[PDB]
């Protein structure tokens, strides 16, 4: 559990200016740095300044766009993504238009993700795509949203916004990672769990899914992330802090 907890901590996207600064401080933990912090776009500049000032410039800055709604207006999602890039994001987590998919429109999800990926790729920014598994609910829809996102060039597929009633489950995590495996894209596509990981014991289980599917070396920071309320504290407690 100590080994899994240290591993999970180093895979976290940890999520007023004073609160952003505090977040950056919290990412620099006694046992190592989280992979990233996650803030709203407007907070990226002050976060970058803080991370540099505390000597942790390698902590990535992630942000969110089309968020949390997953609306199907490509031009708005793209403008927000371009703004996130311009603010200085290292990574952008865009919400997939999951309601449109549930209404039978697969193409708009492809087009939205693709537009955002093209912007991100031009700037060497990673794109994560939030599919909102807790709203999709159905295995087939979770697979479909995952598949479309991957085909459109997602660098990560992500369970959830954290803003709806149901976020990640072990089953939705397994389904999404199976899509990565089945599509043969494990080298280029990561998986991010949001919600459902309250404890160090939970984190261990989610990591074990990846280890079982791909082998224990797969889940590095380019391929696996965590975000959940309370998780950092639980991980630190497991590690003696």
Curated annotation (Swiss-Prot):
The gene is deoC. GO terms for cellular component: cytoplasm. It comes from the Bacteria. GO terms for biological process: 2-deoxyribose 1-phosphate catabolic process; carbohydrate catabolic process; deoxyribonucleotide catabolic process. This is Deoxyribose-phosphate aldolase. The active site is at residues 93, 158, 192. Belongs to the DeoC/FbaB aldolase family. DeoC type 2 subfamily. GO terms for molecular function: deoxyribose-phosphate aldolase activity. NCBIfam families: deoC (TIGR00126). Pathway: Carbohydrate degradation; 2-deoxy-D-ribose 1-phosphate degradation; D-glyceraldehyde 3-phosphate and acetaldehyde from 2-deoxy-alpha-D-ribose 1-phosphate: step 2/2. It catalyses: 2-deoxy-D-ribose 5-phosphate = D-glyceraldehyde 3-phosphate + acetaldehyde. Keywords: Cytoplasm, Lyase, Schiff base. InterPro entries: Aldolase_TIM (IPR013785), DeoC (IPR011343), DeoC/FbaB/LacD_aldolase (IPR002915), DeoC_typeII (IPR023649). Its EC number is 4.1.2.4. Catalyzes a reversible aldol reaction between acetaldehyde and D-glyceraldehyde 3-phosphate to generate 2-deoxy-D-ribose 5-phosphate. Pfam families: DeoC. It is found in: Cytoplasm.
